[PDB]
Write a protein that binds this ligand. Structure first.
Ligand SMILES: Cc1ccc(C(=O)Nc2cccc(C(F)(F)F)c2)cc1Nc1nc(N2CCC[C@H](O)C2)nc(-n2ccnc2)n1
Length: 277
């Protein structure tokens, strides 16, 4: 029970499950009695294995431990009754990838960079807490009604997220906070492009080959030079050369606080010629 030391135990009478939103069990949208609050509810259904129980309660325990503005907030856990449940806050705006694609061009550069600073602060916290995310991507980030981004982990889409993953993590399963930094660079590109697919139609093998050949994603349109410089350094082949999350947070904070620094734009390489008088 020590695993749950940072969690609040919720009584089942306070929870109502309404609609399945994911699927040892299912995830539901529901309501929590604490005037009810909307919540997401992950269940561990009858028949779960020992490994599944250890993973489920371990997930609940770390989510309770995390207490940060940019990490999804655990409302509580049901561990004393069956089915067991993990209950989190709910965001009507949903996941960041779909959000940006449905709001193309609607935000200022400063708003976009602010979302990256928040994601970076959440990741710095996770790394400092010695938690390696392994699946950092815009699809795993929730957006609240204040445009605050909350790092989450919804599990795999299981689709292996090759184009978000650092080379050493793909090649030999070395997942660390430095491979999370690589993923963060990809998230920066996702944000600045309003959710474009990294590497467009390239297949997974083509992406890995391009990376090994030295190619990197080109600059997004209208992107601050400093922001593209930062994402590029997240994609250094040599793990030890990448910035740490503390460096990323510091840089993003300083750019936002001296906002003229974001007015210098990186050149964009057009794919298409339009000749006009
Ligand atoms: C119930 C639930 C359980 C666990 C997690 C979760 O993050 N665990 C996690 C594990 C390790 C590390 C971290 C860490 F470090 F990142 F924090 C976080 C999130 C949700 N809650 C949730 N799950 C979904 N799902 C899940 C099924 C697929 C579906 O498409 C979306 N959707 C919403 N949701 C949507 C709109 N508002 C809220 N909430």
């Amino acid at each position: 029970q020590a695993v749950l030391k940072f969690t609040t135990e919720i009584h089942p009478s306070c929870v109502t499950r309404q609609k399945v939103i994911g699927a040892f069990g299912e995830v539901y949208k529901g309501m929590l009695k604490t005037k009810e609050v909307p919540v997401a509810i992950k269940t561990l259904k009858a028949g779960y294995t020992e490994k599944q129980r250890v993973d489920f309660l371990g997930e609940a325990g770390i989510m309770g431990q995390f207490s940060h503005h940019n990490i999804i907030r655990l409302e509580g856990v049901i561990s004393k009754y069956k089915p067991m449940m993990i209950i989190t806050e709910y965001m009507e705006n949903g996941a960041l990838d779909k959000f940006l694609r449905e709001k193309d061009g609607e935000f200022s550069v400063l708003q976009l960079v602010g979302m990256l600073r928040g994601i970076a602060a959440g990741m710095k916290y996770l790394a400092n807490m010695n938690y390696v995310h392994r699946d950092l991507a815009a699809r795993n980030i929730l957006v609240n009604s204040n445009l605050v981004c909350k790092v989450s982990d919804f599990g795999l889409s299981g689709k292996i997220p090759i184009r978000w993953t650092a080379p050493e993590a793909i090649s030999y399963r070395k997942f660390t906070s430095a491979s999370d930094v690589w993923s963060f660079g990809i998230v920066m590109w996702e944000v600045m492009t309003y959710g474009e697919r990294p590497y467009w139609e390239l297949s997974n093998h083509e992406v890995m080959k391009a990376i090994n050949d030295g190619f990197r994603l080109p600059t997004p349109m209208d992107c601050p030079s400093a922001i593209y410089q930062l994402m590029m350094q997240c994609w250094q082949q040599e793990r030890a050369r990448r910035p740490k999350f503390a460096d990323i947070v510091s840089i993003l904070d300083k750019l936002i606080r001296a906002p003229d620094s974001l007015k210098t734009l990186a050149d964009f390489d057009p794919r298409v010629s339009i000749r006009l008088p």
